Design a protein around this motif. Structure first.
Motif, PDB file in Angstrom:
ATOM      1  N   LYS A  93     -34.441  32.778  72.375  1.00  0.00           N
ATOM      2  CA  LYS A  93     -35.571  31.856  72.331  1.00  0.00           C
ATOM      3  C   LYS A  93     -35.155  30.457  72.766  1.00  0.00           C
ATOM      4  CE  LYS A  93     -39.836  31.036  70.134  1.00  0.00           C
ATOM      5  NZ  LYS A  93     -39.647  30.874  68.666  1.00  0.00           N
ATOM      6  N   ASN A  94     -33.979  30.009  72.334  1.00  0.00           N
ATOM      7  CA  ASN A  94     -33.498  28.670  72.649  1.00  0.00           C
ATOM      8  C   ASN A  94     -32.809  28.587  74.006  1.00  0.00           C
ATOM      9  OD1 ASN A  94     -33.188  25.967  72.159  1.00  0.00           O
ATOM     10  ND2 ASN A  94     -31.658  26.185  70.531  1.00  0.00           N
ATOM     11  N   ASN A  95     -32.716  29.697  74.739  1.00  0.00           N
ATOM     12  CA  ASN A  95     -32.158  29.705  76.092  1.00  0.00           C
ATOM     13  C   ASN A  95     -30.690  29.282  76.096  1.00  0.00           C
ATOM     14  OD1 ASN A  95     -35.227  29.575  76.721  1.00  0.00           O
ATOM     15  ND2 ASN A  95     -34.286  29.949  78.724  1.00  0.00           N
ATOM     16  N   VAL A  96     -29.933  29.764  75.110  1.00  0.00           N
ATOM     17  CA  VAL A  96     -28.490  29.580  75.056  1.00  0.00           C
ATOM     18  C   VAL A  96     -27.754  30.908  74.944  1.00  0.00           C
ATOM     19  CG1 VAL A  96     -28.380  27.193  74.274  1.00  0.00           C
ATOM     20  CG2 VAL A  96     -28.814  29.023  72.628  1.00  0.00           C
ATOM     21  N   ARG A  97     -28.459  32.027  75.119  1.00  0.00           N
ATOM     22  CA  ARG A  97     -27.814  33.332  75.031  1.00  0.00           C
ATOM     23  C   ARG A  97     -26.787  33.513  76.141  1.00  0.00           C
ATOM     24  NH1 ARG A  97     -28.831  38.720  73.310  1.00  0.00           N
ATOM     25  NH2 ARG A  97     -26.847  39.780  73.738  1.00  0.00           N
ATOM     26  N   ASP A  98     -27.088  33.010  77.341  1.00  0.00           N
ATOM     27  CA  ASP A  98     -26.166  33.153  78.462  1.00  0.00           C
ATOM     28  C   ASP A  98     -24.862  32.400  78.242  1.00  0.00           C
ATOM     29  OD1 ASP A  98     -27.866  34.800  79.930  1.00  0.00           O
ATOM     30  OD2 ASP A  98     -28.871  33.102  80.892  1.00  0.00           O
ATOM     31  N   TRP A  99     -24.818  31.483  77.276  1.00  0.00           N
ATOM     32  CA  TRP A  99     -23.622  30.698  76.999  1.00  0.00           C
ATOM     33  C   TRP A  99     -22.902  31.106  75.725  1.00  0.00           C
ATOM     34  CZ3 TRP A  99     -27.630  28.829  79.781  1.00  0.00           C
ATOM     35  CH2 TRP A  99     -27.332  28.102  80.939  1.00  0.00           C
ATOM     36  N   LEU A 100     -23.620  31.602  74.720  1.00  0.00           N
ATOM     37  CA  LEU A 100     -23.041  31.904  73.421  1.00  0.00           C
ATOM     38  C   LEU A 100     -23.321  33.350  73.035  1.00  0.00           C
ATOM     39  CD1 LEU A 100     -23.975  28.624  73.139  1.00  0.00           C
ATOM     40  CD2 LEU A 100     -22.802  29.031  70.965  1.00  0.00           C
ATOM     41  N   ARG A 101     -22.405  33.916  72.253  1.00  0.00           N
ATOM     42  CA  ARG A 101     -22.534  35.273  71.745  1.00  0.00           C
ATOM     43  C   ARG A 101     -22.115  35.293  70.282  1.00  0.00           C
ATOM     44  NH1 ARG A 101     -17.343  38.709  74.031  1.00  0.00           N
ATOM     45  NH2 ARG A 101     -18.373  40.243  72.680  1.00  0.00           N
ATOM     46  N   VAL A 102     -22.666  36.244  69.537  1.00  0.00           N
ATOM     47  CA  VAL A 102     -22.361  36.396  68.118  1.00  0.00           C
ATOM     48  C   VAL A 102     -21.241  37.420  67.979  1.00  0.00           C
ATOM     49  CG1 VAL A 102     -23.397  36.567  65.839  1.00  0.00           C
ATOM     50  CG2 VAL A 102     -24.836  36.091  67.830  1.00  0.00           C
ATOM     51  N   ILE A 103     -20.122  36.997  67.397  1.00  0.00           N
ATOM     52  CA  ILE A 103     -18.929  37.824  67.270  1.00  0.00           C
ATOM     53  C   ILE A 103     -18.498  37.836  65.811  1.00  0.00           C
ATOM     54  CG2 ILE A 103     -16.487  38.038  67.837  1.00  0.00           C
ATOM     55  CD1 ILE A 103     -17.204  36.801  70.598  1.00  0.00           C
ATOM     56  N   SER A 104     -18.177  39.021  65.300  1.00  0.00           N
ATOM     57  CA  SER A 104     -17.661  39.135  63.944  1.00  0.00           C
ATOM     58  C   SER A 104     -16.265  38.531  63.856  1.00  0.00           C
ATOM     59  CB  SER A 104     -17.628  40.599  63.512  1.00  0.00           C
ATOM     60  OG  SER A 104     -16.964  40.751  62.270  1.00  0.00           O
ATOM     61  N   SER A 105     -16.005  37.820  62.764  1.00  0.00           N
ATOM     62  CA  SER A 105     -14.705  37.196  62.572  1.00  0.00           C
ATOM     63  C   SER A 105     -13.637  38.247  62.285  1.00  0.00           C
ATOM     64  CB  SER A 105     -14.761  36.185  61.429  1.00  0.00           C
ATOM     65  OG  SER A 105     -14.476  36.804  60.189  1.00  0.00           O
ATOM     66  N   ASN A 106     -12.406  37.944  62.704  1.00  0.00           N
ATOM     67  CA  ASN A 106     -11.313  38.898  62.544  1.00  0.00           C
ATOM     68  C   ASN A 106     -11.011  39.166  61.075  1.00  0.00           C
ATOM     69  OD1 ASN A 106      -9.950  38.188  65.641  1.00  0.00           O
ATOM     70  ND2 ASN A 106      -9.771  40.250  64.771  1.00  0.00           N
ATOM     71  N   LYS A 107     -10.995  38.122  60.246  1.00  0.00           N
ATOM     72  CA  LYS A 107     -10.563  38.240  58.857  1.00  0.00           C
ATOM     73  C   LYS A 107     -11.721  38.564  57.918  1.00  0.00           C
ATOM     74  CE  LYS A 107      -7.212  38.365  58.288  1.00  0.00           C
ATOM     75  NZ  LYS A 107      -6.100  39.318  58.558  1.00  0.00           N
ATOM     76  N   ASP A 108     -12.728  37.697  57.861  1.00  0.00           N
ATOM     77  CA  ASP A 108     -13.849  37.901  56.955  1.00  0.00           C
ATOM     78  C   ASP A 108     -14.781  38.973  57.501  1.00  0.00           C
ATOM     79  OD1 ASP A 108     -13.351  36.277  54.754  1.00  0.00           O
ATOM     80  OD2 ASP A 108     -14.174  34.491  55.727  1.00  0.00           O
ATOM     81  N   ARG A 109     -15.142  39.925  56.646  1.00  0.00           N
ATOM     82  CA  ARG A 109     -16.020  41.023  57.025  1.00  0.00           C
ATOM     83  C   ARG A 109     -17.494  40.705  56.810  1.00  0.00           C
ATOM     84  NH1 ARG A 109     -13.915  45.881  56.843  1.00  0.00           N
ATOM     85  NH2 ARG A 109     -15.662  46.334  58.250  1.00  0.00           N
ATOM     86  N   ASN A 110     -17.818  39.542  56.246  1.00  0.00           N
ATOM     87  CA  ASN A 110     -19.193  39.166  55.946  1.00  0.00           C
ATOM     88  C   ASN A 110     -19.585  37.858  56.625  1.00  0.00           C
ATOM     89  OD1 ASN A 110     -19.306  41.443  54.370  1.00  0.00           O
ATOM     90  ND2 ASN A 110     -19.378  40.390  52.386  1.00  0.00           N
ATOM     91  N   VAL A 111     -18.995  37.555  57.779  1.00  0.00           N
ATOM     92  CA  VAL A 111     -19.300  36.321  58.491  1.00  0.00           C
ATOM     93  C   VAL A 111     -19.349  36.586  59.988  1.00  0.00           C
ATOM     94  CG1 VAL A 111     -17.954  35.171  56.688  1.00  0.00           C
ATOM     95  CG2 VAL A 111     -17.020  35.403  59.011  1.00  0.00           C
ATOM     96  N   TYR A 112     -20.244  35.871  60.661  1.00  0.00           N
ATOM     97  CA  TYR A 112     -20.371  35.887  62.108  1.00  0.00           C
ATOM     98  C   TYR A 112     -19.979  34.528  62.671  1.00  0.00           C
ATOM     99  CZ  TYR A 112     -22.736  40.407  62.706  1.00  0.00           C
ATOM    100  OH  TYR A 112     -23.036  41.749  62.762  1.00  0.00           O
ATOM    101  N   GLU A 113     -19.617  34.521  63.952  1.00  0.00           N
ATOM    102  CA  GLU A 113     -19.217  33.300  64.636  1.00  0.00           C
ATOM    103  C   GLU A 113     -19.883  33.236  66.000  1.00  0.00           C
ATOM    104  OE1 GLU A 113     -15.062  32.553  64.780  1.00  0.00           O
ATOM    105  OE2 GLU A 113     -14.736  32.901  62.638  1.00  0.00           O
ATOM    106  N   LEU A 114     -20.262  32.028  66.408  1.00  0.00           N
ATOM    107  CA  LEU A 114     -20.830  31.778  67.726  1.00  0.00           C
ATOM    108  C   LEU A 114     -19.733  31.227  68.628  1.00  0.00           C
ATOM    109  CD1 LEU A 114     -24.213  30.121  66.675  1.00  0.00           C
ATOM    110  CD2 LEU A 114     -23.653  32.545  66.908  1.00  0.00           C
ATOM    111  N   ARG A 115     -19.490  31.901  69.750  1.00  0.00           N
ATOM    112  CA  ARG A 115     -18.381  31.560  70.628  1.00  0.00           C
ATOM    113  C   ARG A 115     -18.820  31.652  72.081  1.00  0.00           C
ATOM    114  NH1 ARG A 115     -13.130  34.906  68.310  1.00  0.00           N
ATOM    115  NH2 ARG A 115     -14.490  35.722  66.659  1.00  0.00           N
ATOM    116  N   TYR A 116     -18.155  30.872  72.930  1.00  0.00           N
ATOM    117  CA  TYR A 116     -18.336  30.981  74.368  1.00  0.00           C
ATOM    118  C   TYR A 116     -17.577  32.191  74.901  1.00  0.00           C
ATOM    119  CZ  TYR A 116     -20.755  26.632  75.735  1.00  0.00           C
ATOM    120  OH  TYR A 116     -21.687  25.641  75.949  1.00  0.00           O
TER     121      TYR A 116
END
Ligand code: K
Ligand code: K
Ligand code: K
Ligand code: K
Ligand code: K
Ligand code: K
Ligand code: K
Ligand code: K
Ligand code: K
Ligand code: MG
Ligand code: MG
Ligand code: MG
Ligand code: MG
Ligand code: MG
Ligand code: MG
Ligand code: MG
Ligand code: MG
Ligand code: ZN
Lengths: 91, 99, 76
Positions: free
Chosen positions: B74-97
């Motif tokens: 919706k915000n037109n930032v999908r082409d730049w950012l993706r939602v990735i699960s963190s390596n250590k915590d199993r209950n957190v997501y991270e936004l990364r390029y």
RNA sequence: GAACCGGGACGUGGCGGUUGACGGCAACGUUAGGAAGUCCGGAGACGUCGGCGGGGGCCUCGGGAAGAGUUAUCUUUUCUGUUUAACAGCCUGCCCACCCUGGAAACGACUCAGUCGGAGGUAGGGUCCAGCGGCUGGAAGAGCACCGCACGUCGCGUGGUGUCCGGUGCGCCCCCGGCGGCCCUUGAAAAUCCGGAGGACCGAGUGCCGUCCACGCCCGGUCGUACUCAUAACCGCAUCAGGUCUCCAAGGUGAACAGCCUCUGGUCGAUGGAACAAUGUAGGCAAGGGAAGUCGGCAAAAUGGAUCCGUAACUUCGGGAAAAGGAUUGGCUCUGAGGGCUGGGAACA
RNA sequence: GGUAGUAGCAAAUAUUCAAAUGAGAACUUUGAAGGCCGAAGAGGGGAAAGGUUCCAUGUGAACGGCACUUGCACAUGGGUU
């Protein structure tokens, strides 16, 4: 319900081979596929294995008999004649 | 079930609004088949760089990921950012390029 | 399961088994209803017969007592 | 890396001597637990068809997590993958078969179908048999998916997270079990292996005689192995629309390895360009009539699936028969019926 | 020789766009798109039969019934434990 008026077992042949031949083979078809009394164990468990071979499912005895019946008519006459001759010889 | 969305990197990059994402999650999260019915069962709280979602009943991380992806589109930032699960915590997501 | 739970005896089980093989019962519900109806009818017949025999015995005892009383009166 | 087979030779330990083990009422069990000429049994070892049941693989539905696709609008939604070999031990024990107790009509048990029982059922308790069954070792260290750091020319480099929990079935491929049908048809042999009957003969007192037990040791020859297996790798004189044995087999529709569409995999290889004359080849339609055409209804058209009603003469009584002749069929929203597991009038929850 | 640059190249649905190489590209390679085979296949292996056709590099002439930069052709090497 009465499935066939008179055909019975020969109904498997449909309308082929003629009525007379179907009637003639009906006797053999009934006799060779029927159960026969076993003299050795007193059970109706004698079934034909092959032509002339009759085995009992219960006691396992196997008898040599008629092609399509356990005992041919001439078998009884032969047994009676042999018994008479044996009795005459023994006497 | 408690889950955390980490947007510290985009926030430092001045490309993300934590309040906007919190409002989107509050308006779009479905409780009992109805959207926007958070109430007591589901609570969404924001922070300077992290958004925490808590629900008394069982919740699925995949649903949070799907909502975050919808917001990014919706915000037109999908082409730049993706939602990735963190390596250590199993209950957190991270936004990364991705590049 | 009914035979194991002793809802029915071996004789009624055999009868119901033969009838089931005979296509008498279409489904579970009709078979259960038939079993219940048969049991209820048997119980009603048994209790009616018991009541009739008990009342007959009581009437016979009362008649015997009355006959004894009349015999005592006659003896005087 | 981890196993197995055959053969050879010994050493250690174990086992038997009541010379040749022990246990169980029994079916039989335990890693061992004599033996020569002679003899006996079994496996190898077997047709075809039908139903049913079990196992492995596949298909399929749901949840958890990882990544990807869509996102003007909706979509906790769409897609992908979420693995466990031979072999060793333990457990389990299908359908049968077998053993012990007991003695059955008011006969009972029982299959889809059968069938079984004083020649001993039902019942109770056991033995054995299959397994492509379960757990563990193999084995997570492997494989796969995802997320990172680094050289950035040549480190086949370096690290983390997960690989989880259930359902379902006249489903499909294979294997197995147990019944039943068929035959004037009864549906290989041998190598090899196992078991058994008999007991000639055989040994000692701190060592002898045996030992199919466990561990340890050594060896394993010769030839084939690329590739195609076909609308160009074989034959047909060819890179010929022909011919040539067989294994695997996804989703949808649908009775269906029918036709039609799709996924994996493969492929656009049939010399190309322009035009759209006649005549052709292949495929359609055509007003009114309906075989008048023609040797001849040749060709084409018409009919067609499923559900309900109904079906004549004749007949070898089995058929004729899908005779003939009639009606219906979409979508959407509902209603009713048809089951399993668990829990002591449970006819319930 | 005439026939004659004539008869023919027409079954198996189908190609298109950009780029790379090359003297030369409708026919080679890369990417994108649009189609087909549709699991009793145009997919993945074997038996017979063939015998190097298998793989790499390169290529004058011939051949691959148009063409080719190409290849089951040609030349040099490798490959079957
Ligand atoms: K054979
Ligand atoms: K058979
Ligand atoms: K093996
Ligand atoms: K022996
Ligand atoms: K090979
Ligand atoms: K071959
Ligand atoms: K005519
Ligand atoms: K004529
Ligand atoms: K060139
Ligand atoms: Mg048949
Ligand atoms: Mg399926
Ligand atoms: Mg790993
Ligand atoms: Mg012996
Ligand atoms: Mg030749
Ligand atoms: Mg269907
Ligand atoms: Mg097939
Ligand atoms: Mg080649
Ligand atoms: Zn007998």
């Amino acid at each position: 319900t009465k499935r066939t008026k008179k055909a019975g077992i020969v109904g498997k042949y449909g309308t082929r081979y003629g009525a007379s031949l179907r009637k003639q083979i009906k006797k053999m078809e009934v006799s060779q596929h029927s159960k026969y009394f076993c003299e050795f164990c007193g059970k109706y468990a004698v079934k034909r294995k092959a032509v002339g071979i009759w085995g009992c499912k219960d006691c396992g005895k196997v008898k040599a008999g008629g092609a399509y019946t356990l005992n041919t008519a001439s078998a009884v006459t032969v047994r009676s004649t042999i018994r008479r001759l044996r009795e005459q010889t023994e006497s | 079930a408690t889950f955390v969305i980490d947007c510290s990197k985009p926030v430092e990059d001045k490309i993300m609004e934590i309040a906007s994402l919190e409002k989107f999650l509050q308006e779009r999260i479905k409780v009992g088949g109805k959207a926007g019915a958070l109430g007591d069962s589901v609570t969404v709280t924001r922070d300077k760089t992290k958004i925490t979602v808590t629900s008394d009943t069982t919740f699925s991380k995949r649903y949070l990921k799907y909502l975050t992806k919808k917001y990014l589109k919706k915000n037109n930032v999908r082409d730049w950012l993706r939602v990735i699960s963190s390596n250590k915590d199993r209950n957190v997501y991270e936004l990364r390029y991705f590049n | 399961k009914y035979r194991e739970s002793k809802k029915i005896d071996r004789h009624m089980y055999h009868d119901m088994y033969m009838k089931v093989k005979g296509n008498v019962f279409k489904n579970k519900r009709v078979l259960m209803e038939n079993i219940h109806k048969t049991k209820a009818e048997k119980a009603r017949e048994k209790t009616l017969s018991d009541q009739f025999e008990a009342r007959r015995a009581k009437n016979k005892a009362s008649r015997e007592r009355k006959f004894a009383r009349r015999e005592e009166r006659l003896a005087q």
